[PDB]
Amino acid sequence: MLDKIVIANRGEIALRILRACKELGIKTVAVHSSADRDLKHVLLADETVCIGPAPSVKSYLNIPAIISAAEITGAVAIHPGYGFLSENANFAEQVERSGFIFIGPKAETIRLMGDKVSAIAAMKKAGVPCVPGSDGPLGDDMDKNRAIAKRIGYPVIIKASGGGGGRGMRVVRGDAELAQSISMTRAEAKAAFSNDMVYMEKYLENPRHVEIQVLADGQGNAIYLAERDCSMQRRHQKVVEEAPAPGITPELRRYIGERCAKACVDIGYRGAGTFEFLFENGEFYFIEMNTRIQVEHPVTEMITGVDLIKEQLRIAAGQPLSIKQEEVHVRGHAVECRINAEDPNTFLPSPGKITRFHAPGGFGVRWESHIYAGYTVPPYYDSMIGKLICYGENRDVAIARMKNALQELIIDGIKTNVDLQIRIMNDENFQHGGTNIHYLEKKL
Ligand SMILES: Nc1ncnc2c1ncn2[C@@H]1O[C@H](COP(=O)(O)OP(=O)(O)O)[C@@H](O)[C@H]1O
Numbered sequence: 157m158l159d160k161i162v163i164a165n166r167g168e169i170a171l172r173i174l175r176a177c178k179e180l181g182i183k184t185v186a187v188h189s190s191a192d193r194d195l196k197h198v199l200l201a202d203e204t205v206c207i208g209p210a211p212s213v214k215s216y217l218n219i220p221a222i223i224s225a226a227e228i229t230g231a232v233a234i235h236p237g238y239g240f241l242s243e244n245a246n247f248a249e250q251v252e253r254s255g256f257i258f259i260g261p262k263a264e265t266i267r268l269m270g271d272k273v274s275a276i277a278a279m280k281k282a283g284v285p286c287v288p289g290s291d292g293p294l295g296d297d298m299d300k301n302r303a304i305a306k307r308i309g310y311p312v313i314i315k316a317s318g319g320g321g322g323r324g325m326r327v328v329r330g331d332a333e334l335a336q337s338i339s340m341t342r343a344e345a346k347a348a349f350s351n352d353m354v355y356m357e358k359y360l361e362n363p364r365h366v367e368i369q370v371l372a373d374g375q376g377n378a379i380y381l382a383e384r385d386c387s388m389q390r391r392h393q394k395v396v397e398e399a400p401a402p403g404i405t406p407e408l409r410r411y412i413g414e415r416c417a418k419a420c421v422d423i424g425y426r427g428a429g430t431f432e433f434l435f436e437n438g439e440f441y442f443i444e445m446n447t448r449i450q451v452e453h454p455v456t457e458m459i460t461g462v463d464l465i466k467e468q469l470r471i472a473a474g475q476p477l478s479i480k481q482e483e484v485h486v487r488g489h490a491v492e493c494r495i496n497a498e499d500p501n502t503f504l505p506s507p508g509k510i511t512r513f514h515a516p517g518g519f520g521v522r523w524e525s526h527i528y529a530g531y532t533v534p535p536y537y538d539s540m541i542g543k544l545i546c547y548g549e550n551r552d553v554a555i556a557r558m559k560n561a562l563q564e565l566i567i568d569g570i571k572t573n574v575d576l577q578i579r580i581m582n583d584e585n586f587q588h589g590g591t592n593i594h595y596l597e598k599k600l
Pocket residue numbers: 287313319320321322357358359360361365389392432434443444593
């Protein structure tokens with residue numbers, strides 16, 4: 157095992173990683189911004205280094221500061237978690253160049269799958285089903301460009317090739333009105349992620365978001381660990397996730413799973429990753445791969461027994477996969493509710509001091525959060541402050557337990573989305589299962 161690692165993240169995921177490290181006897185170095193001195197994982201870590209002031213650009217995105225901390229503490233590896241630099245290929249390259257293990261894929265794999273156009277091209281070659289689309293960047297030649305939309309059918313979506321948020325997304329329905337429809341997306345794309353390149357694919361109108369968890373050792377072994385349904389979304393951000401996806405048969409699971417594990421071998425993937433699909437009329441359509449741990453990884457852990465972070469660490473240490481495909485079994489069902497420090501109706505972020513806190517407990521109840529009473533949620537970072545995960549022998553049991561756990565959870569002093577989550581668990585269509593990616597915003 158790795159002697160000592162830097163956790164190059166914060167909040168709940170930093171704590172999640174610290175726990176895995178402690179279990180495996182790996183020493184921890186918590187690097188943190190000056191605003192994050194009081195983070196639970198910082199207080200639990202073996203060593204701590206303040207890497208800069210509060211803004212992410214000066215701390216968690218500060219490559220030289222993170223490397224320097226890893227060097228001075230004598231760490232051998234860096235776990236980037238999710239967000240921040242986890243899918244920054246230049247960071248992964250630099251970490252390895254500086255002589256460290258990067259707990260993630262090779263930098264070239266990150267680049268391959270981080271550019272949507274090269275990603276889709278790689279997936280088609282591997283035999284992963286994709287959304288019929290432009291299969292390349294968009295050009296001003298409307299005589300062949302606007303013929304792309306006709307070939308596939310309307311509506312269509314304009315997506316940024318370096319996009320990953322509420323920017324670089326544009327819904328186009330009109331045939332003639334496309335001589336300036338590509339303008340709105342390109343402006344936002346260079347305004348956000350400094351890359352104007354955009355592509356076109358079919359806007360699927362009744363799809364679910366179904367994604368496949370993979371693990372690969374980078375030695376030729378690759379497994380899939382069932383699927384998750386993450387269809388409950390607001391502004392394209394997931395709110396509720398569950399595993400396995402309702403209605404997905406063992407045969408559909410193996411069909412898509414086998415293709416994802418083959419794609420891993422084909423691209424030389426190393427570590428944890430997730431293939432995201434739109435699922436409509438019994439067909440999967442690849443949209444993107446997250447080349448990192450997934451936020452909602454706990455629901456997969458609950459239904460498979462596989463500790464995904466510990467697996468990332470064993471892989472990073474050069475161990476071949478400890479698990480054969482035949483040994484991956486889906487048992488029971490799990491639901492995750494993201495807990496966000498934001499207003500449950502207007503969604504104004506709600507940073508501030510938590511004056512009273514009580515975590516839910518019980519059989520099948522899992523609570524993933526750094527928050528504690530007296531802790532101040534800083535304004536500088538993403539609003540997700542915790543994740544509540546409930547497991548049961550079936551989906552109805554998991555939901556029942558979630559309803560109860562959400563009622564037990566106390567977070568006073570700030571607004572949270574707990575009231576929204578309660579509403580979702582209470583929604584009759586959610587309870588039936590199979591609601592599409594447009595449902596939550598329609599409900600709201
Ligand atoms: N072709 C599409 N048709 C309809 N909705 C889409 C399409 N592509 C993406 N979306 C919506 O955007 C979400 C995120 O898409 P994704 O390609 O993963 O972008 P990001 O990098 O921002 O996560 C999806 O879960 C889905 O709700």
